[PDB]
Each structure stands twice: as structure tokens, then as C-alpha cells.
């Protein structure tokens, strides 16, 4: 890919494939020019070190990169463990994060969610209403009504969030109680409020700890966030029958 400015950003295989097709391309020549068996016999020995620097580079002299002083990254150094698999076990759309705070007026099953965030995760839902209630002729003219922050969308956004559970989850998620759904309530600010009883399940002090907030999208996925995962089903920690919502 070409970077911005003139430079390119090559992957580290085009530095290794060029080194096999070059050495292989020469060894095709020595068998026509008919060199002695001290050179061509040194060619195959030199090719075979470059097909085996492609598969798993490092079980040899470690053919470090040119124009730089770090070892190249071969194919079998792309599946190998980063402690997590190359594939899935993944980043994710419809997310966010902010500084949690207290909000001790909430019921047990609802967390705050600032206006400036919820207007950004629930965008493709809001586009549904503004073209369903006729308030926008076409979708390109609903994208300019949410950017203006017109005073109509603040009353459509609050009906997209009627019973739509979200998924607060803290960073080092030890046990299954570290992910719990909640029913948002729109506040004003930029801190995700959170009922004080639950803050001992996440193990969250309120001194700067942040918390992502996902969004169950489909229709079978906002029932699994309301039957299985809701915050009023987990009043008993799975490790033992003792409660987990003890007033702290």
C-alpha cells in the first residue's frame, strides 16, 4: 500500500519472495552457462537456505532484514502465538468507553448512557425512524438531520432506546459476572453512570476506571441480553451460592 507522502509500506514477505525468485532465477542460469560443480553446488545450498527462511525463519542463521536491524517475519511466524490466535481466539463495531461514575438514584437494572454516545451507537436505528415517520425523504437527508442535532432527533432517539439492553463490560474480565447487560437511561455528560451495588462484581472503584459498552444488535441477541445476561438474574455468584449483590 502507498503511504501518504510518497513512501510505501510493504509487508515483510515481499522482502523474502524476492530472495527466492532471485536465487532460483540465477540457478536456472548456471545450468545453461555450465559452471563447475563448486558454484552450482553452492547455489542449491544457497537456495535451500532461502526456501527455509520463508517457511519458518529462525531455525537457522536468522536472516535479518535488510535496510534495518530486526529479523524478518516469515509465514510460520504469522500463525504462531501472540497468546491469542491470529483469527478469533477480534475488534468490534458499535462500542465505546468512558469514565464510570456513581449515580446512586438508579434502579438495579439500568445504567446511564450519555446523549453524545447513544446518538452514535444507535445511528443505524435512528435512520430507521427518520425515514419511517416521514421526517426525512431519503437516507442522505437523514444523515444531515442527525449531524445538525436538530431538536426532533432527541425525541426519536429516546424511542429507539425503549427496551434495548446494552452490555457494559470492564477490562480484565475474570469471571462471567464481569459482563452484564443493563437498560440505558439517557443522561447528560460524558461518564457512564452505574448502580453502586453492581460495582463490586466488576471490581470497579470509581477513580478513573473505564468500561466499554457494546450493543446487542439482532432480535435474538437482545433477548439473550434480557433473559440470560440481565443484571437482575445474577444475584448468586456461580463459584458458590453466596450472594454477589451484598451492599458493600
Amino acid at each position: 500500500v502507498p503511504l501518504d507522502g510518497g513512501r510505501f509500506a510493504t509487508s515483510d514477505l515481499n522482502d523474502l519472495y524476492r530472495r527466492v525468485i532471485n536465487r532460483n532465477n540465477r540457478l536456472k542460469r548456471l545450468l545453461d552457462l555450465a559452471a563447475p560443480d563448486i558454484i552450482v553446488r553452492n547455489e542449491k545450498r544457497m537456495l535451500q537456505e532461502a526456501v527455509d527462511a520463508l517457511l519458518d525463519n529462525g531455525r537457522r542463521g536468522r536472516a535479518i532484514t535488510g535496510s534495518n536491524k530486526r529479523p524478518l517475519k516469515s509465514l510460520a511466524d504469522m500463525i504462531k502465538g501472540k497468546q491469542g490466535r491470529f483469527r478469533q481466539n477480534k475488534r468490534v463495531d458499535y462500542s465505546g468507553r468512558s469514565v464510570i461514575t456513581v449515580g446512586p438514584y438508579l434502579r438495579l437494572h439500568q445504567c446511564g448512557l450519555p446523549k453524545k454516545m447513544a446518538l452514535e451507537l444507535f445511528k443505524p436505528f435512528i435512520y430507521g425512524k427518520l425515514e419511517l415517520r416521514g421526517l426525512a425523504t431519503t437516507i442522505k437527508a437523514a444523515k444531515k438531520m442527525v449531524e445538525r442535532e436538530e431538536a426532533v432527533v432527541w425525541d426519536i432517539l429516546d424511542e429507539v432506546i425503549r427496551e434495548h439492553p446494552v452490555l457494559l463490560n470492564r477490562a480484565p474480565t475474570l469471571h462471567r459476572l464481569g459482563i452484564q447487560a443493563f437498560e440505558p437511561v439517557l443522561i447528560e455528560g460524558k461518564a457512564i453512570q452505574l448502580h453502586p451495588l453492581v460495582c463490586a462484581a466488576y471490581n470497579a472503584d470509581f477513580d478513573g476506571d473505564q468500561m466499554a459498552v457494546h450493543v446487542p444488535l439482532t432480535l435474538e441477541a437482545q433477548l439473550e441480553a434480557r433473559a440470560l445476561m440481565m443484571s437482575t438474574n445474577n444475584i448468586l455468584s456461580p463459584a458458590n451460592g453466596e450472594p454477589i449483590i451484598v451492599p458493600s
Binding site: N42, R45, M46, E49, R60, G61
Partner: peptide
């Protein structure tokens, strides 16, 4: 005499 040498440049000169 093949003292576990690996890199060819050791083997070319040898």
C-alpha cells in the same frame, strides 16, 4: 572437522 557449522560462508571458504 565439520564442527557443527551452519552458515554457508563458513562452508564456502571451508
Amino acid at each position: 572437522e565439520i564442527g557443527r557449522t551452519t552458515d554457508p560462508v563458513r562452508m564456502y571458504m571451508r
